[PDB]
Amino acid sequence: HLRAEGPASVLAIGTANPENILLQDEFPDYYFRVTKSEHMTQLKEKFRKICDKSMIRKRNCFLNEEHLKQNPRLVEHEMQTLDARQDMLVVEVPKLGKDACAKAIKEWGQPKSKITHLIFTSASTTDMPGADYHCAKLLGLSPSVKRVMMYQLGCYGGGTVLRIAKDIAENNKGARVLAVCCDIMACLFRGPSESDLELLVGQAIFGDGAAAVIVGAEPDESVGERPIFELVSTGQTILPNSEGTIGGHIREAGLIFDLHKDVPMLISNNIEKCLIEAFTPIGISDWNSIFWITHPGGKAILDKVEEKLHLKSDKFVDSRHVLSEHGNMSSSTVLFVMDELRKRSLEEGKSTTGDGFEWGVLFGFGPGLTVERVVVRSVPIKY
Amino acid sequence: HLRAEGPASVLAIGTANPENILLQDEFPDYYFRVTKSEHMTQLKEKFRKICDKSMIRKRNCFLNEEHLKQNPRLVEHEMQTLDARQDMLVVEVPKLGKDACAKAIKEWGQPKSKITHLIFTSASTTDMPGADYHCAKLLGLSPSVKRVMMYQLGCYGGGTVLRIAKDIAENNKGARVLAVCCDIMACLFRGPSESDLELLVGQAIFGDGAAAVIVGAEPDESVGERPIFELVSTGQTILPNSEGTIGGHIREAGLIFDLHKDVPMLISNNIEKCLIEAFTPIGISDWNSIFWITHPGGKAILDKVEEKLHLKSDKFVDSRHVLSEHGNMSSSTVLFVMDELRKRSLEEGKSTTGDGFEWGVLFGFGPGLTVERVVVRSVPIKY
Numbered sequence: 001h002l003r004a005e006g007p008a009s010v011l012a013i014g015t016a017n018p019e020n021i022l023l024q025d026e027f028p029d030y031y032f033r034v035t036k037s038e039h040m041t042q043l044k045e046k047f048r049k050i051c052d053k054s055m056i057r058k059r060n061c062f063l064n065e066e067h068l069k070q071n072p073r074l075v076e077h078e079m080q081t082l083d084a085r086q087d088m089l090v091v092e093v094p095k096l097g098k099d100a101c102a103k104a105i106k107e108w109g110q111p112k113s114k115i116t117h118l119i120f121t122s123a124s125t126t127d128m129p130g131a132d133y134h135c136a137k138l139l140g141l142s143p144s145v146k147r148v149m150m151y152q153l154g155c156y157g158g159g160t161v162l163r164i165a166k167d168i169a170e171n172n173k174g175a176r177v178l179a180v181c182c183d184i185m186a187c188l189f190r191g192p193s194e195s196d197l198e199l200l201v202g203q204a205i206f207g208d209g210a211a212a213v214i215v216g217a218e219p220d221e222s223v224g225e226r227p228i229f230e231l232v233s234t235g236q237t238i239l240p241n242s243e244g245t246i247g248g249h250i251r252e253a254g255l256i257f258d259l260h261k262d263v264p265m266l267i268s269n270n271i272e273k274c275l276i277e278a279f280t281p282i283g284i285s286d287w288n289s290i291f292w293i294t295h296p297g298g299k300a301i302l303d304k305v306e307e308k309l310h311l312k313s314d315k316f317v318d319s320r321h322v323l324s325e326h327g328n329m330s331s332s333t334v335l336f337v338m339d340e341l342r343k344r345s346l347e348e349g350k351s352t353t354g355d356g357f358e359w360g361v362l363f364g365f366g367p368g369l370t371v372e373r374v375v376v377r378s379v380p381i382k383y
Numbered sequence: 384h385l386r387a388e389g390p391a392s393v394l395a396i397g398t399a400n401p402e403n404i405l406l407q408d409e410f411p412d413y414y415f416r417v418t419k420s421e422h423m424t425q426l427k428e429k430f431r432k433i434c435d436k437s438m439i440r441k442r443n444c445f446l447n448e449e450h451l452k453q454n455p456r457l458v459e460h461e462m463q464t465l466d467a468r469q470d471m472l473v474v475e476v477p478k479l480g481k482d483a484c485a486k487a488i489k490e491w492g493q494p495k496s497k498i499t500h501l502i503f504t505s506a507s508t509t510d511m512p513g514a515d516y517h518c519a520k521l522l523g524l525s526p527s528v529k530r531v532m533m534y535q536l537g538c539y540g541g542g543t544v545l546r547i548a549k550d551i552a553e554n555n556k557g558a559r560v561l562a563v564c565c566d567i568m569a570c571l572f573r574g575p576s577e578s579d580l581e582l583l584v585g586q587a588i589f590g591d592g593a594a595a596v597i598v599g600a601e602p603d604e605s606v607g608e609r610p611i612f613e614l615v616s617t618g619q620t621i622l623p624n625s626e627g628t629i630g631g632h633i634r635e636a637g638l639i640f641d642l643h644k645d646v647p648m649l650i651s652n653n654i655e656k657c658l659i660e661a662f663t664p665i666g667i668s669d670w671n672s673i674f675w676i677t678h679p680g681g682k683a684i685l686d687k688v689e690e691k692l693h694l695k696s697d698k699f700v701d702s703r704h705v706l707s708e709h710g711n712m713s714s715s716t717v718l719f720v721m722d723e724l725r726k727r728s729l730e731e732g733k734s735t736t737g738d739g740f741e742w743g744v745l746f747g748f749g750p751g752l753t754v755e756r757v758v759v760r761s762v763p764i765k766y
């Protein structure tokens with residue numbers, strides 16, 4: 001049985017979003033108008049302060065006002081609407097995922113018949129056959145591509161798809177793994193109630209997007225393959241004292257979510273143990289001596305991690321950039337951060353794809369409370 | 384990192400079912416009585432013929448008549464009932480899965496802290512955090528167990544979990560993978576309509592169960608590990624001219640399924656291609672010279688494959704026995720077949736765990752139409 005030699009690497013990254021944009025300056029007034037909730041004057045001003053403090057300036061969003069006029073049940077606080085949401089999302093999720101995959105394939109530059117495996121994750125929908133089947137068909141992949149469908153992971157799933165891809169690519173000589181994440185927030189959009197600030201936090205922060213990577217071991221430079229990041233080691237853990245703090249449920253009313261106020265403190269108070277476990281085998285203890293690829297679940301998670309570890313403000317630039325332009329897109333977000341990091345490193349004349357550092361860490365955070373961790377190495381930029 | 388040498392093997396198998404039983408000879412009268420549909424006299428007689436031809440003698444079934452009396456919306460033909468089904472199934476799916484896992488761990492005989500990974504599949508429910516999280520908590524696994532949650536695969540998923548486990552176990556020295564499938568048909572139970580035989584076929588065939596395996600490379604005989612089957616090679620394919628023939632959708636009314644009359648012919652007309660691809664590299668062309676571990680999706684699938692390939696009656700003994708005593712339990716069913724094969728081989732004095740044969744094939748069939756294939760080797764039974 002022929003296995004590969006040496007580590008799996010990310011060979012290409014592609015991203016996509018719906019064309020329609022929500023400008024955050026306009027969002028409190030838009031949301032309270034389309035939901036027929038203008039009478040809630042005090043709640044609207046509380047919501048404006050949440051949106052202003054979020055550090056999100058714009059979001060892409062497939063759902064538009066004409067969808068809401070065609071089905072006004074979607075603007076109610078709680079109404080049976082899953083079937084309408086699914087009718088949209090079982091089509092749009094694989095379509096936007098295929099758009100990200102086509103951009104990754106173009107960068108990679110190899111024939112699409114060389115793709116041996118396809119991993120697909122989304123928390124926005126579920127169906128049989130799944131988004132993996134439709135994405136493969138829209139791309140014209142081999143019917144014998146080996147698929148890994150992972151519905152309903154949530155915000156840690158960008159780390160999960162890299163962890164799954166690493167073992168496949170290393171155990172199978174010649175394997176080339178296409179891994180894609182895609183979410184569309186029409187699954188969870190609904191109108192306000194007078195007391196429910198938890199619902200409003202989600203309505204302010206979640207946005208739409210897809211991101212795809214090609215992963216393989218033994219890159220062949222002679223045909224034009226080029227590694228961007230090496231995948232070194234992985235971990236997945238459940239934080240102590242964290243039950244129920246991040247949740248998401250598929251219900252008759254749509255996707256219903258739970259977000260506890262303690263989430264930023266729980267991440268920040270546990271993240272040093274994750275780093276010690278990952279980096280002691282490599283001989284590293286200085287968290288300012290590595291690059292970071294961090295899921296921006298909210299501005300408070302980034303601010304509290306930076307403060308707890310005394311990180312320099314260089315580490316989170318790409319996480320803050322993606323947050324500002326796209327909001328929280330669930331699993332795909334950390335892959336947008338990876339793309340921005342390597343692109344900015346080249347634009348700024350840095351020595352490696354990881355802002356001039358050799359070693360780095362990737363983190364995703366989501367339901368459990370689960371932390372996905374990947375130790376990564378950059379590649380030199382040769383000029 | 385340190386990778387393992389040699390092939391991954393199944394080291395232990397455990398199974399579980401709800402205690403409540405449906406006798407098939409009584410099911411036409413039970414179903415039409417509890418769904419308040421006795422006025423459909425001609426439909427009930429057609430259903431009696433379907434149940435008599437199904438070659439299912441009994442099924443285990445968590446849903447009972449007292450559940451139906453407490454919530455009569457569950458016996459309507461089509462009614463908004465997903466929330467009530469999920470409220471039951473988010474609890475009962477990880478519970479029944481844990482029961483199968485505990486039996487596999489007892490056979491294996493090693494500390495549960497040696498489990499490094501947990502794979503979970505179910506088509507009956509979906510939630511965040513998932514059934515994998517709850518099953519790991521109920522078992523008391525390490526919080527750092529690496530989880531692989533796969534919701535909504537369907538009837539091919541017993542093959543899928545083996546395919547995922549193989550690459551994890553081979554690429555990581557010391558890895559021990561717990562892989563579990565679990566389905567509970569309360570997700571799809573509903574009352575009849577005057578015309579709809581497709582719905583009734585599913586009401587006659589689907590039953591409840593869970594099955595778990597432990598998979599690892601480099602078994603250690605000195606501490607009591609013993610391989611049962613070696614996992615040699617894997618494939619996943621989509622059959623030509625099969626779009627739409629097997630489907631399942633999560634809707635306000637529950638799990639809604641599609642089953643086309645052409646399914647048995649499509650499988651039988653394509654299965655030889657699958658065998659030639661799997662076995663030509665090994666030098667094998669005689670399909671009666673290997674053992675078979677086949678998902679019994681319905682009696683007609685088995686009948687048409689046997690006829691097409693001129694298989695001897697020995698090949699489908701265990702598939703037919705599991706169908707008789709349990710019905711179609713979705714992804715877990717093929718792992719019940721694997722357990723029965725190795726237990727019967729010991730009881731009947733055969734020389735290997737695969738009915739005296741060296742080489743074998745495992746098949747799962749489900750939405751796509753997708754076929755999962757695994758080439759396996761038996762191990763000797765020696766004294």
Ligand SMILES: CC(C)(COP(=O)(O)OP(=O)(O)OC[C@H]1O[C@@H](n2cnc3c(N)ncnc32)[C@H](O)[C@@H]1OP(=O)(O)O)[C@@H](O)C(=O)NCCC(=O)NCCS
Binds near residue numbers: 055201263264301366
């Ligand atoms: C939402 C956020 C951007 C607001 O920033 P901020 O205004 O500087 O922070 P504050 O803590 O002052 O929150 C503003 C208001 O929102 C409320 N709020 C914030 N998070 C909340 C939650 N999870 N549930 C309920 N209310 C919440 C606060 O109680 C406060 O209201 P009050 O002043 O009436 O008490 C910030 O709290 C954040 O980034 N949170 C993390 C979001 C998260 O968990 N993301 C993961 C998604 S899976």
Ligand SMILES: CC(C)(COP(=O)(O)OP(=O)(O)OC[C@H]1O[C@@H](n2cnc3c(N)ncnc32)[C@H](O)[C@@H]1OP(=O)(O)O)[C@@H](O)C(=O)NCCC(=O)NCCS
Binds near residue numbers: 438
């Ligand atoms: C259901 C089954 C056990 C019935 O066996 P049988 O009675 O010997 O087979 P028949 O083909 O004569 O079918 C009996 C009746 O069921 C009907 N029927 C069978 N499969 C059907 C389907 N998929 N949709 C609608 N009606 C169906 C037949 O049309 C026939 O009714 P009719 O005489 O009024 O036309 C058999 O057809 C079977 O095993 N089918 C495969 C099930 C399957 O696809 N499983 C995969 C699950 S994902």
